[PDB]
Amino acid sequence: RSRLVQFQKNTDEPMGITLKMNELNHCIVARIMHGGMIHRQGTLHVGDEIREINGISVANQTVEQLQKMLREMRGSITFKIVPSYREF
Numbered sequence: 001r002s003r004l005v006q007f008q009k010n011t012d013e014p015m016g017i018t019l020k021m022n023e024l025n026h027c028i029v030a031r032i033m034h035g036g037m038i039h040r041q042g043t044l045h046v047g048d049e050i051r052e053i054n055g056i057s058v059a060n061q062t063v064e065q066l067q068k069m070l071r072e073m074r075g076s077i078t079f080k081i082v083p084s085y086r087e088f
Contacts, residue, residue: 001082002051002080002081002082003080003081003082003083004078004079004080004081005043005044005078005079005081006043006076006077006078006079007037007038007041007043007076007077008075008076008077009037009073009074009075009077010074010075013037014033014036014037015036015037015038015070016032016033016035016036016037016038016039017029017031017032017033017036017038017044018030018031018032018033019050019066019070021063021066021067024058024059024060024061024062024063024066025059026049027049027050027051027058027059027066028047028048028049028050029044029045029046029047029048029049029050030046031046032044032045032046043079044079044081045083045084045085046084047084047085048081048082048083048084049081049082049084050079050080050081051079051080051081051082052078052079052080053066053069053070053073053077053078053079053080054073054076054077054078055078055080056069
């Protein structure tokens with residue numbers, strides 16, 4: 001019950017998000033900067049769990065690796081996520 005979300009990062013502007021790195025077993029979107037890149041597009045919500053980034057499993061990386069990875073990426077970025085918001 002996951003989902004794929006994509007967005008372009010063809011600039012050096014930050015994505016405008018804060019991720020919880022404490023436990024890569026469950027990497028959570030902790031904050032989304034208002035007006036930021038992620039925000040204006042609606043690509044993510046606070047609470048969503050990021051499972052993969054361009055097919056790479058977040059659970060198998062180190063904070064250092066994940067940190068550098070995300071910041072150095074440019075072009076198309078695809079996140080495999082477990083959405084936190086559900087309507088009933």
